[PDB]
Amino acid sequence: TAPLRIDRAGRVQTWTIDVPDAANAITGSDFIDAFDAAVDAANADTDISVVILTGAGRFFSAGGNSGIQRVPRALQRCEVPVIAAVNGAAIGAGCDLAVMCDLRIAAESAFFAESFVQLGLIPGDGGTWFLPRAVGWARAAEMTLTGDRVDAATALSWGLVNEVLSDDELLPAAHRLAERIAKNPAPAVRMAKRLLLESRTASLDSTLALAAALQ
Amino acid sequence: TAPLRIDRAGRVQTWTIDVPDAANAITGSDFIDAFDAAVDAANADTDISVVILTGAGRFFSAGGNSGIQRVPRALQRCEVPVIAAVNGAAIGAGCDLAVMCDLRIAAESAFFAESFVQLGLIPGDGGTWFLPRAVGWARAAEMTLTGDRVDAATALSWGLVNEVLSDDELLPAAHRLAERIAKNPAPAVRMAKRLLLESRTASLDSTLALAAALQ
Amino acid sequence: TAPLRIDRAGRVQTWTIDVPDAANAITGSDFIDAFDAAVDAANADTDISVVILTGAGRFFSAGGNSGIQRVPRALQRCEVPVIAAVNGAAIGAGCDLAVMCDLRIAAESAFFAESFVQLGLIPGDGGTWFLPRAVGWARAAEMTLTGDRVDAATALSWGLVNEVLSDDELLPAAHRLAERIAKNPAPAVRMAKRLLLESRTASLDSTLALAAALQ
Amino acid sequence: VTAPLRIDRAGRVQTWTIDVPDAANAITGSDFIDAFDAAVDAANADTDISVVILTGAGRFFSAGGNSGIQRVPRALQRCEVPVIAAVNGAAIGAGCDLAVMCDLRIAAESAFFAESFVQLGLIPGDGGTWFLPRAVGWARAAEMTLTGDRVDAATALSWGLVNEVLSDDELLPAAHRLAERIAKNPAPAVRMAKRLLLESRTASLDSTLALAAALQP
Amino acid sequence: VTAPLRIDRAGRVQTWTIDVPDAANAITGSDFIDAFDAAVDAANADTDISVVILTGAGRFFSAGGNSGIQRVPRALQRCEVPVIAAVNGAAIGAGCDLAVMCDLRIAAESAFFAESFVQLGLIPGDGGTWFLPRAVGWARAAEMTLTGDRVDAATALSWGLVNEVLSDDELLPAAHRLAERIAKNPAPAVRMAKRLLLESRTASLDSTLALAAALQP
Amino acid sequence: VTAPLRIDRAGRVQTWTIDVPDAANAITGSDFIDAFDAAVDAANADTDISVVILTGAGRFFSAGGNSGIQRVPRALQRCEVPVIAAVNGAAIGAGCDLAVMCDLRIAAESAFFAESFVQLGLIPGDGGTWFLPRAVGWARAAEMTLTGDRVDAATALSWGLVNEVLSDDELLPAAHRLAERIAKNPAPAVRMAKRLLLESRTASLDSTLALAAALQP
């Protein structure tokens, strides 16, 4: 079946990871190709202001077993905000994918595992850059050096996710969050995200020059 | 009336935004001129070790409708710590002003709104650089992309403010906080702030070289 | 007596600060020499995957009264994760040492004080670079500009430490945490820490290039 | 009209010839940009390739033309093989910036460069202001960008904008000699070295040391 | 004694002449610093102005003199118009650093430069160590800063510290010719280009691409 | 075989002579690395020392040899005194990078440089790719690193890799003249200036201004 289902509802698109023979792994070339295409199509449709990314079934993404860097690079050029609605296990590359999204919310049955170290590996997809910016450096160290699972309540406590919902309330909550963004003029939403992206790395002077030019 | 009232109490100055015909907006040239002057006068009076910034009446600052960058640049050259005592609505430029201060405390009736996106605008004053450093990137994205209001308890929960007080206890609490700083030798307070400012952007090696030179 | 006791238990070493005539101060040349040696010996013994750093007696380190930068530089070249098990007062240089470790846990009788400002000084050892990355900039400003003590519960609330234990449960908890790391292949633990260190400062592109090369 | 980027292979060296004859080899058209994307991706994928020579068909290197114009800089940023600009004629506007984004430049005696944007009320929208100071130093980049005036081949040589100036007939032979001095070396090491050189433009010393240590296998 | 910074306008070009005759055009006095602040702010505000020529009255460009000395570098950092240093004579200490902080330098045959601080037991307190390597490269900046010795006009030309050396009578005519090659261009584009060039000294490529895309309107 | 790094003192100038005769002055052996660490630490500790001249015994500067190789770059990074490389002969591989890591280079007419790693399927594992572009610019560094070919003394001079080329007999006399132009200045100011110059390679302008203000006492 199609590894990434794309549903549109107004100014919001929902992307559903659907790799049922591999627990929603994102390392297959079909999925990577579909993810590239989804980003480019969302960028090109200026009516779209929010993407909700979630997984079909019990898993968000078991991750799977540079090519593994195409999905992270696709997200970096995505102009619209991306909300990860983490419905279940987010493991390995699947954990890093959720952490690379702009906002995370989770079902109570979700959990995260920066599992690479347990396999003799490091996060080859850039997860070590994004994780300390979601939970702080000490918690990112705990997650990366033990590889252990973090359940939904702990994730909320650490700021890894913004809210925790019952399994039935997760997607309704993601759409409510998406609509609080989508009510605003689409070009401004995209300009705001571009400015926020700049602020992660650039100096204050660079941000001031960009903000003055964009306004 | 004078748009920025300056009261002195020992080693602490209190600055009160007072633009009553515009809900304490800070975009007027009179206020901007007075803010410039206040910073320079505080820098020059080496007895001053803390500034408390607050708003007269019900508002901290409704913000108002590069020139909008003079106030942020004035705060960057202010050598003394600035405590924002947010007594009410802090909207738009007023939100960013509070976020640019070193420390925030709030009355229970305060709220914050990074409202620009709702107007088809981005924060033209550098708010996108400071906000992720107060609340983390995911919460800054939520605030900037929805533009929605954040009440005092939520702000405390997110780390946007350090304490929440009753409306009557706000300024007494700000002075207690200011005095915990002002009890210390004034030159060291200023050197410490200069070092902390360096650490926001510079490498560890740059901070080590500066600390070794200052000591 | 020996200022830094080194105990080995499997893949975990415990380092105990033991300067009983100076409340575990770390500014003495004997301690600094022993700390240098401990780091180099731990780096060279590839079986070691975790260091637990703690203090003998009632103090973690009262700190004491560039040379004060040798201990911070030793920690920067330490390849293995370091867990600070803060058993008591961590003051001045002792506070900064704990903050420079990768992870902190604390006994209920522990407290932290970025005390330099009260002495007319700034943190000459790089504490201003590490502290905002443990507690955020506003809390680091509060700690550095007042110099006041932060007790264990407040430290937990601010994210300065990851857990707070009874005085009797502190070291058992540190070993449980260390073992969650040490169960993993030692070379991967060290590669993961090296990647996490890179992510503190480098761009996303630099982290992606390093991760691709290490994998 | 024609394939906008002709791709020739000679051993481990590919030549890319800009060929937009109805617009003086402008690179701002979407057909060219798409072909440049594809050529970079194909060269990265073919581990037999070690060097690209980039040049223009006919009298022009690239007259430049009239975010989309930023796809070309980003493509060169992800290009793993060294790129030699063999500037055979006018390199104007976007064409000037393209040559400056390449790793090495050599020029024909009839070549010239112009950061012409300012003369039309424009700025270099493609990142030329980032690359030009790293080719000629900040003062000469300011002179070129703020006046927009043309810089001939001899002046370009004097400023270090190009490494050598050849007669029109000797340009491509010289580009191939230079390419062969690279292509003689083991192909994986050439690509790793370029990746290291790219990292050094911005990263700290510590970052370069970490990458070099990681790459040596 | 006199107005420390004389301001002349000729079309879109302003000339600022340092005039501190009782201290050999030193720029460390609070009167001069205040005037330099005001001149930058006035030039930014007058959108008709496109170029500043900075030069010294009499025999000296600036003997330098004896945070306050850091207001001048910060003023040039916020100056939106290009600044040409027309170095007519000795540029010593703070005066050397001022010339190096300008966008372009040209010099009279009697000019010379000296990063003299080290000879008096001092370091360049005004940021000269940041700007000098970007003018002459790190090795020559080390030579100038660690010896403190004087660099004459011909050596300065050879090192790229200045772009041209003119006879004493031809310096200001040459500075105006260079200024006019800038000032002929649309005034808003000249200022946007300088803002882009300033961003490129430090920012990543991605930051420059984002700003260039935002500025083109 | 012998002390791998001979240390001579003449007033405030120390000369370090690489002396590994059974391996053509290679610097990759653990004995040499240990001695280089010790020499840097001893020179930092002796406040009477103001300049180091680094050179090779015999015909070679350093043939380089076959993380451990990264201790030498890190040692030079913490060396507080200026280091002049007096390149008396072949500087190959790690030896090329060592010369480039020094503050100033001068060379004998028989010297040459080779970033030879790529020819053996290797990359510069010691940080040479970070330092080389800052000595010769990014295009020449790419040429040297991607071809690996030898650069003779005259070409090195032309590219700014070295500041002067001397006859074999005049090299060390010239190195001492250059060292004395530094060593004549107050020793604490020389070290503070180098610390400021090191900061400027990477830090923002604001960081340099803050450090300069803090260091002037």
UniProtKB/TrEMBL annotation, chains A, B, C:
Coiled coil: none
Organism of this sequence: Mycolicibacterium smegmatis (strain ATCC 700084 / mc(2)155) (Mycobacterium smegmatis)
Origin organism lineage: Bacteria, Bacillati, Actinomycetota, Actinomycetes, Mycobacteriales
Protein keywords: Fatty acid metabolism, Lipid metabolism
Function: Could possibly oxidize fatty acids using specific components.
Family: Belongs to the enoyl-CoA hydratase/isomerase family.
GO biological processes: fatty acid beta-oxidation
InterPro entries per UniProt: ClpP/crotonase-like_dom_sf (IPR029045), Enoyl-CoA_hyd/isom_CS (IPR018376), Enoyl-CoA_hydra/iso (IPR001753)
Pfam families reported in the protein's UniProt record: ECH_1 (PF00378)
Reaction catalyzed: a 4-saturated-(3S)-3-hydroxyacyl-CoA = a (3E)-enoyl-CoA + H2O; a (3S)-3-hydroxyacyl-CoA = a (2E)-enoyl-CoA + H2O
Protein name as annotated: Enoyl-CoA hydratase
An annotated Gene Ontology molecular function: enoyl-CoA hydratase activity
